Amino acid sequence: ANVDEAILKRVKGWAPYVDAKLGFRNHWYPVMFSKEINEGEPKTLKLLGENLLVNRIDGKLYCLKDRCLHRGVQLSVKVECKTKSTITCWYHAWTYRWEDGVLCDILTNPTSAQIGRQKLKTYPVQEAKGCVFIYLGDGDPPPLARDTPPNFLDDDMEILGKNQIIKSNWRLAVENGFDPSHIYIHKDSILVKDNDLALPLGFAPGGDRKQQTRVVDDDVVGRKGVYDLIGEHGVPVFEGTIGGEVVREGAYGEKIVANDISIWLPGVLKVNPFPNPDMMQFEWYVPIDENTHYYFQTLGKPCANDEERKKYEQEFESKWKPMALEGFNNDDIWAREAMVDFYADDKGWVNEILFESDEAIVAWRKLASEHNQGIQTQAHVSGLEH
Amino acid sequence: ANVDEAILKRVKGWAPYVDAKLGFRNHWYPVMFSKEINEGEPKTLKLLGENLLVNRIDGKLYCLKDRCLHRGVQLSVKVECKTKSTITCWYHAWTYRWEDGVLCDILTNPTSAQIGRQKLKTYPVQEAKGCVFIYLGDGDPPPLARDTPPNFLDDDMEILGKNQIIKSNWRLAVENGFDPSHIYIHKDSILVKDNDLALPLGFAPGGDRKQQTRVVDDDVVGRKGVYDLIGEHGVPVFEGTIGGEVVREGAYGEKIVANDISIWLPGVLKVNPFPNPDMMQFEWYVPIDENTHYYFQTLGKPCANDEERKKYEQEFESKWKPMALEGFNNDDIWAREAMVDFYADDKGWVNEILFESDEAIVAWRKLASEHNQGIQTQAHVSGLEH
Amino acid sequence: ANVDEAILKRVKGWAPYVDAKLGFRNHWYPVMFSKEINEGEPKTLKLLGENLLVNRIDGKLYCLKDRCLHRGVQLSVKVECKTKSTITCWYHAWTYRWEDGVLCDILTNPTSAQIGRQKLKTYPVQEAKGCVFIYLGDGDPPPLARDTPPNFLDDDMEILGKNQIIKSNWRLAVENGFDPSHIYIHKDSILVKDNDLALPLGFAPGGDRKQQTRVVDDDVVGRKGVYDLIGEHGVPVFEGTIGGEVVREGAYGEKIVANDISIWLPGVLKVNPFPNPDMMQFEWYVPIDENTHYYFQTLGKPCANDEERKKYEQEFESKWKPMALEGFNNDDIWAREAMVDFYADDKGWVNEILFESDEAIVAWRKLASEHNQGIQTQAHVSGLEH
Numbered sequence A, B, C: 001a002n003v004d005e006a007i008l009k010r011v012k013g014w015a016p017y018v019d020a021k022l023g024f025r026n027h028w029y030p031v032m033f034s035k036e037i038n039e040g041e042p043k044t045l046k047l048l049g050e051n052l053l054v055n056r057i058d059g060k061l062y063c064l065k066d067r068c069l070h071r072g073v074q075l076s077v078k079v080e081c082k083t084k085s086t087i088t089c090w091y092h093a094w095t096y097r098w099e100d101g102v103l104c105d106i107l108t109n110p111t112s113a114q115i116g117r118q119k120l121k122t123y124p125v126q127e128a129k130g131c132v133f134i135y136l137g138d139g140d141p142p143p144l145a146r147d148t149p150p151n152f153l154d155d156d157m158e159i160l161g162k163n164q165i166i167k168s169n170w171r172l173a174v175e176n177g178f179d180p181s182h183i184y185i186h187k188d189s190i191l192v193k194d195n196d197l198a199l200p201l202g203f204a205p206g207g208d209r210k211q212q213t214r215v216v217d218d219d220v221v222g223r224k225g226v227y228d229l230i231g232e233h234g235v236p237v238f239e240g241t242i243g244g245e246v247v248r249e250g251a252y253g254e255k256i257v258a259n260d261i262s263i264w265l266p267g268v269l270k271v272n273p274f275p276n277p278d279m280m281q282f283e284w285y286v287p288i289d290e291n292t293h294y295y296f297q298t299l300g301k302p303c304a305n306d307e308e309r310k311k312y313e314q315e316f317e318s319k320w321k322p323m324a325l326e327g328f329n330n331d332d333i334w335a336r337e338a339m340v341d342f343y344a345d346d347k348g349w350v351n352e353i354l355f356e357s358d359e360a361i362v363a364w365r366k367l368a369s370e371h372n373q374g375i376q377t378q379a380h381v382s383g384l385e386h
């Protein structure tokens, strides 16, 4: 659908992942924080190439396609919400219900035969952990847990975060995050010194292929992911040599982090524990279009009462956001950007030369290829045909 | 020629209009005001995708293609008019007559065999009502009146105006202007209050389909257009309801405007009377390229002597330009812009969902499809082949 | 390979030149001055569409493709030269030798099976006359002299220069430089007055076709070029007439320049003598990509000792650079730019209408078509396929 068929033949058995340049349909995706959208103040965003409107009405979130059925304009060019339950297109006043998208009135012609006989596309929206998730899919949504990493939705788990727009395809972001050897780029992070981390330069793998990862297709809520097990039979590399001469060393700190690393559909990474031995990082790479993604970062820490939550919030702001989310992950951002050119023409997928640690990524490409709930296409974006 | 043949099959009987993304050839178009081009001061513009040069020589206008026959450079990069009757290309001095475009000399080789045996394309130019019209066509031009709305060329009719470049396809501009229900966008215009207009929100049409418009193919000078007759059997809407609740009202002023509205080939709208009961608006949407048009606005008012003309000019400057041409039509401009995305891939023409007032636009699409004097193509732009 | 096959059929026997939009492979090209690259300070550039890294190591130049074999990132995003003889990719520390491009180590996995079994592309580099030349080709390079104009590599010849990036295809630059009638554009140059040059407006050619040029395929070092002989049987034009009236004259100075003019593969012009009767100009138009070239200007003057070289350098800086390289050749730059649009769609090659002086260019197109060492393609740029 999205990629030259000749390229897809050459990547037999990751073909669906390579074709998924616009992301996977029929999954939940986070797109903003609860606090960023107030009652009766609609917001625009693009998700899987589709312009959407989100509104809060009586505290509850509704999502409509931001495209009038009449002449295809964005309603958001000029929002006219003239009753709590509706939005009126600024152009000829076609009026839609937030709840089901039905065209319930037209101000310019209250006798039109279109009234009650057209419906704008809606998508389910759910808040959880102060995060807004949209189900960019058709039919009844699965439970959110299916599309979230283990422990993200535990009651005591306190989630704080940052979101921004990054100029790479979402897959470059996923692959970079789940890439065992990419740790090399983090070797000079401020967070490595100022939080005393142990961080290898890389890994000398051991064991067979299958032992490099755990493929999860047996989780009870239907989650699908891969654990990076390179450290189980593998030896960490702390001395980097060229011609046998030591030219770089890893970091010899006390704090042990990233005991478990896992990537889940539709494209969320869990690193545990990180950036501190008492915390978790969950980050999403959410497809906006083929060139762009939301880098939706969250840090989870169990909190037992309001006091622990106050405490957490204060170190999040003063330490963990500037030192980890920025000071550690900024390098991830420009690593992703550096892969764009080679993958832009879809040929990177056939001309890359992989090495042993890339077995984690291969396993993700196969898991995504097989367990995704649908390939988003340009036809989904441009609509059904009249 | 311009649009995927599969899309053209799906719009049977507006096909030629849908294909006409570069405009219609063999029509007159206004491109600037007389006063903007002085004796011996040539100007560049693009029209139907073609770069043109216009010059005033002994008070009379001449138009040449701004593209040297030799290496395809624009002569306008550096104009060398070295005799009244000629222009010399800055590059190898190939020299052309303004009057007929004939290559009459080459300064770099006065013995060249090309001399007298090559001719640059010319187009007829005519001034009328202080407006410059170019016939972007081949052969002897028709009379200007064919390509102008009724009454624009009456002797007493005093024409004043504004021109600018707008970033939409010309057809989006035409359709917006002739769109009976688009009046909704004008509901908050400064001109509606400060000139006390009656302005409905829209119309509940009545009568049959044929009664919604008058198709003119019987006018004596060969004009072809459509009158919007929605108001004849239709009821104006002044109260906009959602779920039966009044949420917006129209404007209840004294001044009656836009009794007659008509769109003519090649793409000029006449609204009478407007913006005042003693005036007319004629506005053109002139194709520059596929993404761009001149929004050539004029206001006509009968003046019987120099005194009335002085009077007119002074209210034009102080009131009608800032309050109407800008304060009313600015909303038209961004309405046109808002349609670009849906029509950019040529699919809007098949995926729009029209309603009853769009019968005016359908009638225009059929009139344009049938009575246009030619479809401009990329081959017209890039030239005949050697 | 690069141009619609239907266009190539229509230019039978310049087809290879018309297809060579990315330049000719298996030739030497100058890309920078010796002084611009210091010991251990690597530089990035693009040549024939390929991103390259150049380094100076123990005073000697090495060139590697700036593209990691692993995930296709540019090593130059963050250079890590951790031993004199190597460069380590910033991403997973794949480490390459400058000398042969062999992947000799990976810091992230010193046990990888890739080590010693992969090789990054290298290109030969040679300095001569304080100019850096790269052989953008495969196999053992020919001697540099093959790809340089006569006399450029004479021991006494002192070479000084300027380089910059110009936004046209390299062929527009070549053709402009070797274009006998383009001298018209130089008629108002500051250098024409302030250095008292004789400069015609153009030429009335005489003799037959073959006498307009000397095609050199008989030079002993394998050089291939064309001499412009228009002035041998031709008459210079000093009076430009329109309808027999003199409207422009040439320049009637004392200093005779440009007695011999020659264009050589891969695309270097020699004008002798110029810009002074005791000097030579050699300028290259080096393909960067399809839209861009290095305009690599040099002035050669025989110097017999360090004193003459000091003298030369001082007038180069104070006079010849600002007055000639800039004050004369700046017009060349915007002439080249003015041809871009007509040649952008590859149709200029069929729709141009040539005249008698263009016989020099035709002869160059045939010489290039026949004696080029290879056509650079997008496949050379994007690589061999896995």
Ligand SMILES: Oc1ccccc1-c1cccc(O)c1O
Residues within 6 Å of the ligand: A176, A177, A178, A183, A258, A261, A271, A274, A281, A283, A329, A332
């Ligand atoms: O993925 C990792 C491996 C080892 C140490 C830290 C990380 C890590 C944590 C959060 C986000 C990332 O991109 C990481 O690379």
Ligand SMILES: Oc1ccccc1-c1cccc(O)c1O
Residues within 6 Å of the ligand: B176, B177, B178, B183, B258, B261, B271, B274, B281, B283, B329, B332
């Ligand atoms: O087209 C109209 C319909 C009703 C009231 C005013 C206008 C009008 C007049 C001039 C230019 C326009 O775009 C209009 O919409």
Ligand SMILES: Oc1ccccc1-c1cccc(O)c1O
Residues within 6 Å of the ligand: C176, C177, C178, C183, C258, C261, C271, C274, C281, C283, C329, C332
């Ligand atoms: O090519 C030329 C012909 C006659 C006089 C000067 C030149 C010349 C010298 C150096 C570079 C150029 O582009 C020229 O046109």
Ligand code: FES
Residues within 6 Å of the ligand: A068, A069, A070, A071, A072, A073, A089, A090, A091, A092, A093, A094
């Ligand atoms: S485009 Fe929205 S009502 Fe017409």
Ligand code: FES
Residues within 6 Å of the ligand: B068, B069, B070, B071, B072, B073, B089, B090, B091, B092, B093, B094
């Ligand atoms: S391009 Fe105009 S004379 Fe050569």
Ligand code: FES
Residues within 6 Å of the ligand: C068, C069, C070, C071, C072, C073, C089, C090, C091, C092, C093, C094
């Ligand atoms: S991209 Fe260079 S080592 Fe991985």
Ligand SMILES: [Fe+2]
Residues within 6 Å of the ligand: A176, A177, A182, A183, A186, A329, A332
């Ligand atoms: Fe990372």
Ligand SMILES: [Fe+2]
Residues within 6 Å of the ligand: B176, B177, B182, B183, B186, B329, B332
């Ligand atoms: Fe309007």
Ligand SMILES: [Fe+2]
Residues within 6 Å of the ligand: C176, C177, C182, C183, C186, C329, C332
């Ligand atoms: Fe020149």
